[PDB]
Design a protein that fits this description.
The structure holds 6 chains of a larger assembly.
Chain A (H helix, E strand, L loop, with lengths): L13 H13 L5 H14 L3 H10 L5 H7 L4
Chain B lengths: L1 E3 L5 E3 L4 H14 L5 H8 L5 H9 L5 H21 L17 H4 L6 H9 L6 H20 L2
Antiparallel strand pairs in B: 1-2
Classes of the chains: A mainly alpha (about 70), B mainly alpha (about 150).
């Protein structure tokens, strides 16, 4: 399965999705800078509308514990 | 493998059955998963080419992958021979011969020869050259076997 | 079982067939040149029509990762 | 087997029960599969003929194969005797006797005799001669037992 | 069970019978010469008519791989 | 058993629990099957009479066979005493006593006595004499327990 095919379900907790992401990211062998680009970009983009909304409110500069606690009720 | 003895010299000692079986069990359980590569790397510490063919030859199953790896090992070996040409004139009596891709793959060399190269001063890391080919070929497999 | 008796099913993935091939090839003891001849020849010949069609489009010079990714949807 | 001791000499030490059992378990699980041959080869490292008959005699099951192997071992042994004739005149007091096919098969030789030949200078590799016969006979079996 | 009581079924593959034979032969402790006599004699004698017929065509001098491949379709 | 120490002398060391248990497990699994005899032979390498009674006494089950063996061990022992008469006159202060059937069976001898006989020069192989009786009695059993 390709990294672009990794997406969050409509009922799937973000948490279970983030695990899937760094597992597939774990099978990507690209430069770190590209993998940083993938992190800030693709993760949020394939996140579900309800959490996506939430993550837009965190702004930039956000870290994984704060994202992970931010989308917990969703 | 080639290990350091108490006396303070590097000598060959055989690899252990529950090490062998641990190699088997990893492959059984985690197949092509990435954790196989650090795992391999730890269990290949101080290992010979000869021991590395033993580990590859003792696999059962996943024969498409095993063939892809073989063919990667030969490609990487062909590339060793290309990049490093044979040296000028006859081999000195006082010296031992430079390795080829097939000596690195363990095929054309004997154990005592593999111990000569590694234990001698300077030493040459023919394990680590095969190790990269294995890891490189492991990346090929991992990338393919991603679904 | 003989190497000539190794053939791909009508619903069998190529992949599962290629595994069977190099297992049986693993029990053949012939010269490498003959085993090369067997590789380029017999593998495709006993491959199923749908993949066989696919493999004909790869042309010659093809390697196993490209064959294996080529017949994946079949 | 005959192993090197800490003091720096080659001495005999017995083979281990979980080594024995690992030999048993391989045969139980993988029967005639090719992985049996590298596996055998690793577990036969530094082994005597005597230990090799022990391993063959301790098999249960697959008695048609075990008989085919026996008969291959005797054929290969008959061939050893053919190719290498006995030597000229009486055996020297200062020297030890040349082996026959049956000494290689372990049958006519004693352990101390098997240790004399291997530890002595030059050493003779009677294990490796039996090993090829075993591997050759393993090919015969593998080829037959292919379906 | 005695070695004389070892016989091949009318539908039993020879192979399964030969295994039974060298297992029971494995529990006989007689001189090798006698056990050679048992091998060439009793094995064929208690073999079934269809294979028995086959084995008669191999003639003498035959070895176990050739007997075992000879009675395979039977 | 009596094993060689690093220093280069023969000393007694105890047999291991997973060796003991491996003896138990063999008997559990393969009962009277012939593979039991090479198996026994390997696990009896360097063993004392005392250790051999320990192995026989630790059996559970197959008590008809265990009694047949006992009675074979005593017959073979009675035969030892018959064939080898006691020697002329009193025992020398400088020497140690010749064994009887019951010393071979371990019954009338102590461990230190069993170590005296085996470690002394010439050594006497009281293990190997009991071993044949065990193997002989094993043949009796195997032949009977064939169905």
């Amino acid at each position: 399965t390709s990294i672009l095919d990794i997406r969050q379900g409509p009922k799937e907790p973000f948490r279970d999705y983030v695990d899937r992401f760094y597992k597939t990211l774990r099978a990507e062998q690209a430069s770190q800078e590209v993998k940083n680009w993938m992190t800030e970009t693709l993760l949020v983009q394939n996140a579900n509308p309800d959490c996506k909304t939430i993550l837009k409110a965190l702004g930039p500069g956000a870290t994984l514990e704060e994202m992970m606690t931010a989308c917990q009720g969703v | 493998p080639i290990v350091q003895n108490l006396q303070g010299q590097m000598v060959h000692q055989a690899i252990s059955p529950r090490t062998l079986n641990a190699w088997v069990k990893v492959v059984e359980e985690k197949a092509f998963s990435p954790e196989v590569i650090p795992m391999f790397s730890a269990l290949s510490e101080g290992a010979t080419p000869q021991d590395l063919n033993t580990m590859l030859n003792t696999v059962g199953g996943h024969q498409a992958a095993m063939q892809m790896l073989k063919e990667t090992i030969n490609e990487e070996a062909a590339e060793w021979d290309r990049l490093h040409p044979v040296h000028a004139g006859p081999i000195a009596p006082g010296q031992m011969r430079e390795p080829r891709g097939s000596d690195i793959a363990g095929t054309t060399s004997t154990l005592q020869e593999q111990i000569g190269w590694m234990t001698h001063n300077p030493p040459i890391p023919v394990g680590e050259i095969y190790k990269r080919w294995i890891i490189l070929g492991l990346n090929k497999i991992v990338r393919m076997y991603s679904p």
